[PDB]
Amino acid sequence: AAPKNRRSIEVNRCRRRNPQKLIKVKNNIDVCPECGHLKQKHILCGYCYEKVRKETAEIRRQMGKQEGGPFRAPTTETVVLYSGETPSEQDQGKRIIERERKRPSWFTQN
């Protein structure tokens, strides 16, 4: 089937300016209490999840160094340490990762 006539710009304005083809205004946007950036109500904060992600990457690098090869992985629970910290007895007998950065405020001691 081939179109029988060129459509007028009028008909096209009608079709493609329809309230359905318009982008809806998202009403669930808020600010995150920490960094004060924008985030959607049901989703994690992007900027927070970033610093979390970076730190996870680095701790995984150092614990990649503590492991000798590809298939070799620890049977103990792991506990990560920061400058100035010494292991509690609850946490001893476990694999320990030592890090230069003083323990970040959002990551707790527990």
């Binding site: 982008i23 205004v25 946007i29 924008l38």
Partner: protein, 166 residues
């Protein structure tokens, strides 16, 4: 090419006579030859119109279209020039006055088909224009009430003449 919009920042006004209304700052900004198409860019431009700059930034930020990152940078640039190069107190005081897309120049290429037929494929470019004005966003127009309509109707019944009659 035509450059006009950019030059709309070069107008210098006569100084203010005493106690008149302070004419609010107008800032113009454009971005030429974006790799986006004109028609897609239009929807973004339509979305943010009339919004305060913070709401516009909010909307754009979470939107999916690849035009969103583009119009975002353009609004940030606009805001920075609004406080720096012109003088605007209170940088959140801006609202979007006019937002629009024009078509840029296009690239032309071959598109092969089958049985040795070819279509002519046009690589699309577009410009994005935005005018910001310092002040609180203008009020959105409320849908006509029955008290409005009845007033129109009466005003019309009362505008009649006896025609061809004198």
């Amino acid at each position: 090419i035509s450059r006009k919009w950019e030059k709309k920042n070069k107008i210098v006004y006569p100084p203010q006579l005493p106690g008149e209304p302070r004419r609010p700052a107008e800032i113009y900004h454009c971005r030429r030859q974006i790799k986006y198409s004109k028609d897609k860019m239009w929807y973004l431009a339509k979305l943010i119109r009339g919004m305060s700059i913070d709401q516009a930034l909010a909307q754009l930020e979470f939107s999916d279209k690849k035009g969103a990152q583009i119009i975002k940078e353009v609004l940030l640039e606009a805001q920075d020039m609004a406080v720096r190069d012109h003088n605007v107190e209170f940088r959140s005081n801006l609202y979007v006055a006019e937002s629009t897309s024009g078509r840029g120049q296009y690239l032309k290429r071959i598109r092969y088909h089958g049985r040795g037929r070819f279509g002519i494929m046009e690589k699309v470019f577009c410009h994005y224009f935005v005018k910001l004005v310092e002040g609180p966003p203008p009020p959105r127009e409320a849908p006509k009430t029955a008290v409005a309509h009845a007033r129109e109707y009466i005003q019309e019944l009362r505008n009649r003449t006896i025609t061809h009659a004198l």
